[PDB]
Design an enzyme around this catalytic site. Structure first.
Site, PDB file in Angstrom:
ATOM      1  N   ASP A  39      43.710  41.424  46.095  1.00 54.49           N
ATOM      2  CA  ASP A  39      44.181  40.071  45.706  1.00 54.49           C
ATOM      3  C   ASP A  39      43.144  38.994  45.989  1.00 54.49           C
ATOM      4  OD1 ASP A  39      46.116  38.349  44.567  1.00 54.49           O
ATOM      5  OD2 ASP A  39      47.037  38.017  46.578  1.00 54.49           O
TER       6      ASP A  39
ATOM      7  N   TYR B 132      54.463  33.265  52.203  1.00 52.82           N
ATOM      8  CA  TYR B 132      54.197  33.778  53.506  1.00 52.82           C
ATOM      9  C   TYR B 132      54.774  32.935  54.655  1.00 52.82           C
ATOM     10  CZ  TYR B 132      50.749  30.074  53.969  1.00 52.82           C
ATOM     11  OH  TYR B 132      50.148  28.807  53.971  1.00 52.82           O
TER      12      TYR B 132
ATOM     13  N   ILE C  85      48.590  22.143  57.090  1.00 51.57           N
ATOM     14  CA  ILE C  85      47.529  22.514  56.143  1.00 51.57           C
ATOM     15  C   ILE C  85      48.094  22.922  54.796  1.00 51.57           C
ATOM     16  CG2 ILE C  85      45.735  24.116  55.561  1.00 51.57           C
ATOM     17  CD1 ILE C  85      45.012  24.215  58.618  1.00 51.57           C
ATOM     18  N   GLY C  86      49.007  23.874  54.814  1.00 52.69           N
ATOM     19  CA  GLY C  86      49.590  24.361  53.571  1.00 52.69           C
ATOM     20  C   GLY C  86      50.740  25.294  53.784  1.00 52.69           C
TER      21      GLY C  86
HETATM   22  O1  LIG Z   1      45.125  33.505  56.245  1.00 50.88           O
HETATM   23  C1  LIG Z   1      45.582  32.619  55.493  1.00 50.88           C
HETATM   24  N1  LIG Z   1      45.221  31.318  55.572  1.00 50.88           N
HETATM   25  C2  LIG Z   1      44.359  30.696  56.487  1.00 50.88           C
HETATM   26  C3  LIG Z   1      43.945  31.322  57.672  1.00 50.88           C
HETATM   27  C4  LIG Z   1      43.061  30.716  58.532  1.00 50.88           C
HETATM   28  C5  LIG Z   1      42.572  29.454  58.183  1.00 50.88           C
HETATM   29  N2  LIG Z   1      41.730  28.626  58.832  1.00 50.88           N
HETATM   30  N3  LIG Z   1      41.543  27.466  58.145  1.00 50.88           N
HETATM   31  C6  LIG Z   1      42.274  27.502  57.050  1.00 50.88           C
HETATM   32  C7  LIG Z   1      42.214  26.406  56.031  1.00 50.88           C
HETATM   33  C8  LIG Z   1      42.667  26.602  54.728  1.00 50.88           C
HETATM   34  C9  LIG Z   1      42.707  25.525  53.867  1.00 50.88           C
HETATM   35  N4  LIG Z   1      42.333  24.289  54.228  1.00 50.88           N
HETATM   36  C10 LIG Z   1      41.915  24.112  55.477  1.00 50.88           C
HETATM   37  C11 LIG Z   1      41.846  25.123  56.420  1.00 50.88           C
HETATM   38  C12 LIG Z   1      42.986  28.788  57.016  1.00 50.88           C
HETATM   39  C13 LIG Z   1      43.904  29.417  56.167  1.00 50.88           C
HETATM   40  C14 LIG Z   1      46.564  32.920  54.444  1.00 50.88           C
HETATM   41  C15 LIG Z   1      47.965  32.366  54.892  1.00 50.88           C
HETATM   42  C16 LIG Z   1      48.871  33.586  54.865  1.00 50.88           C
HETATM   43  N5  LIG Z   1      47.973  34.746  54.987  1.00 50.88           N
HETATM   44  C17 LIG Z   1      48.465  36.070  54.809  1.00 50.88           C
HETATM   45  C18 LIG Z   1      49.429  36.523  55.863  1.00 50.88           C
HETATM   46  O2  LIG Z   1      49.644  35.846  56.842  1.00 50.88           O
HETATM   47  N6  LIG Z   1      50.111  37.637  55.595  1.00 50.88           N
HETATM   48  C19 LIG Z   1      50.237  38.295  54.304  1.00 50.88           C
HETATM   49  C20 LIG Z   1      51.525  37.853  53.637  1.00 50.88           C
HETATM   50  N7  LIG Z   1      52.689  38.069  54.511  1.00 50.88           N
HETATM   51  C21 LIG Z   1      54.003  37.730  54.044  1.00 50.88           C
HETATM   52  C22 LIG Z   1      54.249  37.432  52.719  1.00 50.88           C
HETATM   53  C23 LIG Z   1      55.512  36.976  52.326  1.00 50.88           C
HETATM   54  C24 LIG Z   1      56.534  36.765  53.257  1.00 50.88           C
HETATM   55  C25 LIG Z   1      57.797  36.102  52.855  1.00 50.88           C
HETATM   56  N8  LIG Z   1      58.557  35.571  53.837  1.00 50.88           N
HETATM   57  C26 LIG Z   1      59.627  34.873  53.428  1.00 50.88           C
HETATM   58  C27 LIG Z   1      59.992  34.762  52.106  1.00 50.88           C
HETATM   59  C28 LIG Z   1      59.167  35.373  51.198  1.00 50.88           C
HETATM   60  N9  LIG Z   1      58.047  36.024  51.538  1.00 50.88           N
HETATM   61  C29 LIG Z   1      56.271  37.059  54.587  1.00 50.88           C
HETATM   62  C30 LIG Z   1      55.045  37.559  54.979  1.00 50.88           C
HETATM   63  C31 LIG Z   1      52.474  37.661  55.903  1.00 50.88           C
HETATM   64  C32 LIG Z   1      51.178  38.121  56.468  1.00 50.88           C
HETATM   65  C33 LIG Z   1      46.760  34.402  54.230  1.00 50.88           C
END
Ligand SMILES: O=C(Nc1ccc2n[nH]c(-c3ccncc3)c2c1)[C@@H]1CCN(CC(=O)N2CCN(c3ccc(-c4ncccn4)cc3)CC2)C1
EC number: 2.7.11.24
Length: 335
Positions: free
Chosen positions: A140, A27, A22-23
Site C-alpha cells: 500500500d 486507523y 495531526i490527522g
Molecule cells: O504511521 C502513520 N502515521 C504517522 C506516523 C508517525 C509520524 N510522525 N510524523 C507524522 C506526520 C505526518 C503528517 N504530518 C506531520 C507529521 C507521522 C505519521 C500512519 C497512521 C496509522 N498507521 C498505520 C497503523 O497504525 N496501523 C495500520 C492500520 N491499523 C488499523 C486500521 C483500521 C482500524 C479501524 N479501527 C476502527 C474502525 C475502522 N478501522 C484499526 C487499525 C492500525 C495499525 C500509519
C-alpha cells in the site's frame, strides 16, 4: 483529567503531554506530543481496533513488522502505551518519531524540483530495498505513507497491509486483473505511480473502478504485447485483455514534457505492464537517474528476513488481541 484532541482522549500521561492534532483515518487519530522523559516531541497514534478481526490483523502486522525493522527510511516504534490487563485494553497508543509532513500534503501545495524528486525517489527505493530484502511486500505505497522532515529526509510508514512474500490508484494492473502470482513487483508499480505524481502533482491512473483504471493504464502504456499476454497464468485475465481494443503507447514526454529524460526512462521501467519485466528495486537504485545518490555501501538489507506467512487470517479477534498484548509487553516494566 487526560488530554483531549478533537474529542478523542489521549490517555498517555504523565510521560507524554501537550497533545496536538495531526490527522486521522480509519486507523484512528495521530497527534504530536511531548516526551517528558526523553525531552523530545513525538508522534502518538491512538488505535482502537478490538471490535473487528480485520482491524486486529492490521494492528498486529504494524506492530510486529515495525518492531523488527530498523532502517533510516522506515518509521520505527519508540514506545507503546496500553492497559495493564487484556480486559482493560481498549486503545493502543503507538509512539513514533515526529516528522514535518507527508508527501500527500506536500503535493497539495508545492511543485517539486527535480532535485527534490530525485532525492525522494532515492529514499523510497532505499527503504523499499530493505523491505523487499526482508521478504516483505508493503502492498500500500502511496504519498500519504511517505513521511518527510525539514531537510527532506523521508520515511515509509503503514505496514498494516504488508505480507510476507509467498485509494486503489497505486495498485498494479496484475492485482486488478486478478492475474494471480503477485510478487515484489507490485510495490515497484506503486513507486512508479508516486514518481509520476511527483512530476505532475496529480495521480497518473485514477479511475472509478478497476475496469476504468485499467483502461487509463492501457491508454497510456498501450496494449500488452501477445508475449506479455502469454505470461499471464490466469486465463480469465488473458481473455479480458484480449477483449480490449488496441491502444498505442503514449510517449512519457507527452505527459511530462519538463521531466528529466533519465527520470522518464526509470518511470517507464517501473510502470512496465508485465510484472516479470518490471525493474527490481536494486536495479532501480542503480539507474542513471539516481546516480547522484546511489551507494550500495549505504543501502542496507534486513538481518533476518521473514521466512513464513504470519498466518493471521483465521485467528479470532480475541486471540489477535492477546497476541497484540504480548507484542506490546516489551514496553511494560520488568520485575
Ligand atoms: O504511521 C502513520 N502515521 C504517522 C506516523 C508517525 C509520524 N510522525 N510524523 C507524522 C506526520 C505526518 C503528517 N504530518 C506531520 C507529521 C507521522 C505519521 C500512519 C497512521 C496509522 N498507521 C498505520 C497503523 O497504525 N496501523 C495500520 C492500520 N491499523 C488499523 C486500521 C483500521 C482500524 C479501524 N479501527 C476502527 C474502525 C475502522 N478501522 C484499526 C487499525 C492500525 C495499525 C500509519
Amino acid at each position: 483529567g487526560p488530554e483531549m484532541v478533537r474529542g478523542q482522549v489521549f490517555d498517555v500521561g504523565p510521560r507524554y503531554t501537550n497533545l496536538s492534532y495531526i490527522g486521522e483515518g480509519a486507523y484512528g487519530m495521530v497527534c504530536s506530543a511531548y516526551d517528558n522523559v526523553n525531552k523530545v516531541r513525538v508522534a502518538i497514534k491512538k488505535i482502537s481496533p478490538f471490535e473487528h478481526q480485520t482491524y486486529c490483523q492490521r494492528t498486529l502486522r504494524e506492530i510486529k513488522i515495525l518492531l523488527r525493522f530498523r532502517h533510516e527510511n522506515i518509521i520505527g516504534i519508540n514506545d507503546i502505551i496500553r492497559a495493564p490487563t487484556i480486559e482493560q485494553m481498549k486503545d493502543v497508543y503507538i509512539v513514533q518519531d515526529l516528522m514535518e509532513t507527508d508527501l500527500y500534503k506536500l503535493l497539495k501545495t508545492q511543485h517539486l524540483s527535480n532535485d527534490h524528486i530525485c532525492y525522494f525517489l532515492y529514499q523510497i527505493l532505499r527503504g523499499l530495498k530493505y523491505i523487499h530484502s526482508a521478504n516483505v511486500l508493503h502492498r500500500d505505497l502511496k504519498p500519504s505513507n511517505l513521511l518527510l522532515n525539514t531537510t527532506c529526509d523521508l520515511k515509509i510508514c503503514d505496514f498494516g497491509l504488508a505480507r510476507v512474500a509467498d485509494t486503489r490508484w497505486y495498485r498494479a494492473p496484475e492485482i486488478m486483473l486478478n492475474s494471480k502470482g503477485y510478487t515484489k513487483s507490485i510495490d515497484i508499480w506503486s513507486v512508479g505511480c508516486i514518481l509520476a505524481e511527483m512530476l505532475s502533482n496529480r495521480p497518473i491512473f485514477p479511475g472509478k473502478h478497476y475496469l476504468d483504471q485499467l483502461n487509463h493504464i492501457l491508454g497510456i502504456l498501450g496494449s500488452p504485447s501477445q508475449e506479455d499476454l502469454n505470461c499471464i497464468i490466469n486465463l480469465k485475465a488473458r481473455n479480458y485483455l484480449l477483449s480490449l481494443p488496441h491502444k498505442n503507447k503514449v510517449p512519457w514526454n507527452r505527459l511530462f514534457p519538463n521531466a528529466d529524460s533519465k527520470a522518464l526512462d526509470l518511470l517507464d521501467k517501473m510502470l512496465t505492464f508485465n510484472p516479470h519485466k518490471r525493474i527490481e528495486v536494486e536495479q532501480a537504485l542503480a539507474h542513471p537517474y539516481l546516480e547522484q545518490y546511489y551507494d550500495p555501501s549505504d543501502e542496507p538489507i534486513a538481518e533476518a528476513p521473514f521466512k513464513f506467512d504470519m498466518e493471521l487470517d483465521d485467528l479470532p479477534k480475541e486471540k489477535l488481541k492477546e497476541l497484540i498484548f504480548e507484542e506490546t509487553a516489551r514496553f511494560q516494566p520488568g520485575y
